[PDB]
Design a protein around this ligand. Structure first.
Ligand SMILES: Nc1ncnc2[nH]cnc12
Lengths: 18, 344
């Protein structure tokens, strides 16, 4: 599922600005 | 349609601009000092420093104090952006914008002391619960729509919308924080800035851009609130950018038909077709079928029942925030970067 793919990804924590 | 309701909005924004420009042209400076406050706990961090919960000694009020290291600001080439941030925040006034109470600087750091918003970041609540219902997401989205209508009328672009920056107050309403990329500009600008998941295609492709990037970012925020994940995600930023510019977006099967239609018009790569950027301006958004139940005046007046009220153990409590490693606040005996920040 797309949700499962998100939760296993490296970008579920706080995202820094560029 | 331009009727009585639209003329009231127009007159409200005209008076708001008169008040903003007075403060924009004559900014407040040096309105407190460091030893007026007891430092309590770190509420969040960023590239230049940290936001801390503090207690004002003379009143006993709690505030959130953002601390920026001047030398780190210089190394990241953020001088002008930091002057933008403070000059804009001290001049604005709107129910869903966090209030700046004091600002000052010393040999080492810059300080912005704001109202403490105790309910935590929307980010924390959204990740924990998974996703918001569409009425929940609509309640928050309406506040952002009105806040951008206000900011854009003052020729301001915000450029960093994301749940990490949206704080929930004790009434359950949003307060926007972090104006590090906000800029007052008539016409177009060119800086590559923002957060990868929220960047409009025209930013990635190094075109000139304008306030339409905020409306794209609203589309990303509404999608993420209602789905639980953003519309373009990957493990590496370059992969995110490839998805953003591709022109393709997919929706969860539980999104309503109206929600998908609104998001197709906000997440529109063609600027001649993106909602918020057409002849009707913000009213293409405010009059979309997904917002049919939204009473815009009642939202502004905070008379709508909120989806939830944050837990509150008492004054000065931080239970709605993560814990961060605490670091000293060092003030050098020599002034750093004085000329660069003389107007702060
Ligand atoms: N990060 C933050 N947390 C709480 N209140 C704030 N006011 C301004 N920024 C804040």
């Amino acid at each position: 599922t797309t949700y499962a793919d998100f939760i296993a990804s490296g970008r579920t924590g706080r995202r820094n600005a560029i | 349609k331009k009727g009585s309701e639209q003329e009231s909005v127009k007159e409200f924004l005209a008076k708001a601009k008169e008040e903003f420009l007075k403060k924009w042209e004559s900014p407040s400076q040096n309105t407190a000092q460091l030893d007026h406050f007891d430092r309590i706990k770190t509420l969040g961090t960023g590239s230049f420093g940290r936001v801390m919960l503090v207690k004002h000694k003379e009143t006993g009020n709690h505030y959130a104090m953002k601390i920026l290291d001047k030398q780190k600001v210089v190394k990241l080439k953020q001088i002008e952006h930091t002057l933008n941030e403070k000059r804009i925040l001290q001049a604005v006034n709107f129910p869903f914008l966090v209030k700046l109470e004091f600002s000052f600087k010393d040999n080492s750091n810059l300080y912005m002391v704001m109202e403490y918003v105790p309910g935590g970041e929307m980010f924390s609540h959204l990740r924990r619960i998974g996703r918001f219902s569409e009425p929940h997401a609509r309640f928050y989205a309406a506040q952002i729509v009105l806040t951008f209508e206000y900011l854009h009328s003052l020729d301001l672009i915000y450029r960093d919308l994301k749940p990490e920056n949206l704080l929930i107050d004790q009434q359950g309403y949003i307060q926007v924080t972090d104006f590090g990329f906000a800029k007052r500009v008539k016409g177009r600008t060119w800086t590559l800035c923002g957060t990868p998941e929220y960047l409009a295609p025209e930013i990635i492709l190094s075109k000139g851009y304008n306030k339409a990037v905020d409306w794209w970012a609203l589309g990303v925020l509404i999608y993420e609130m209602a789905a639980g994940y953003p519309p373009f995600f990957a493990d590496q930023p370059i992969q995110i950018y490839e998805k953003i510019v591709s022109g393709k977006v997919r929706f969860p099967s539980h999104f309503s038909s109206d929600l998908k239609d609104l998001l197709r018009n906000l997440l529109q790569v063609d600027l001649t077709k993106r909602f918020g950027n057409l002849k009707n301006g913000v009213n293409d958004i405010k009059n979309h079928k997904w917002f049919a139940t939204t009473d815009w005046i009642a939202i502004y007046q905070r008379k709508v029942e909120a989806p939830f009220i944050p837990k509150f153990k008492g004054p000065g409590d931080t239970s709605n925030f993560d814990d961060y490693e605490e670091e000293e606040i060092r003030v050098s005996i020599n002034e750093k970067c004085g000329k660069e920040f003389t107007e702060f």
